[PDB]
Design a binder for this molecule. Structure first.
Ligand SMILES: [Zn+2]
Ligand SMILES: [Zn+2]
Lengths: 122, 123
DNA sequence: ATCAGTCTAGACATA
DNA sequence: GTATGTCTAGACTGA
């Protein structure tokens, strides 16, 4: 991405979904800042994709959903759309990697939203 | 006044407050249908100001506030703004009538929202 | 501090 | 039917 192009893109407006994504990430960071080293870890997974990373997790809701700026979704599905598959459609398209200790189906107190602890399939 | 004048007014758009009030009324009416005859009573009070009326009440929140369509206010003040003094500013301007058994300050289970169970005072 | 505002988990309701 | 949305009391975050 080009210097002149980058500048013009600075003024570009975002689709409602791009703006909603900003809130969803902004919400997640708020959660992670409280825990020690969660941010650095989440940053690790996204920056170095090949190298394995430990889970980054948020508390699970009773039905498992998360609400961000009036919209309800599943945590792994939401954050996987942001960083890996923008067209991801449902939790059925996702399955966990064995590395993950807190997958969505886990039904544990916590749910991992590390996008690289899940694998997209049909 | 003229019937045409009313019809032209029917097409009037309403400011955000006028629309918010409609939502606030819808919220209460949704609550009151659950209770027996409360609707019939609330109309009695609004229809006959002279004739005294029994309390009409809604559940009390912990901080006492009520939220409607993202806006928080006190229940007696909200509904008093709708039907008696639209310029009411805070609960300091309101005091309860002796008739009311569920006034705002009472810290009871239910809160009377009957506008004719309160009196306005300059403060 | 009372006061006011924002955010969302849970409850409820419709599709 | 479960999936998807609506609404707000409570939590929380600042004067
Ligand atoms: Zn994980
Ligand atoms: Zn009363």
């Amino acid at each position: 991405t080009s210097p002149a192009v980058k500048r013009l893109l600075g003024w570009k407006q975002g689709d409602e979904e791009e703006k909603w994504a900003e809130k969803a990430v902004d919400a997640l960071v708020k959660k992670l800042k409280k825990k020690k080293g969660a941010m650095e870890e989440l940053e690790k997974a996204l920056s170095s994709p090949g190298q394995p990373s430990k889970c980054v997790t948020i508390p699970r809701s009773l039905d498992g959903r998360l609400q961000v700026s009036h919209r309800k979704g599943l945590p792994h599905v939401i954050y996987c759309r942001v960083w890996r598959w923008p067209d991801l459609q449902s939790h059925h398209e996702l399955k966990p990697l064995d590395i993950c200790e807190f997958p969505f189906g886990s039904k544990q107190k916590e749910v991992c939203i590390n996008p690289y602890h899940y694998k997209r399939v049909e």
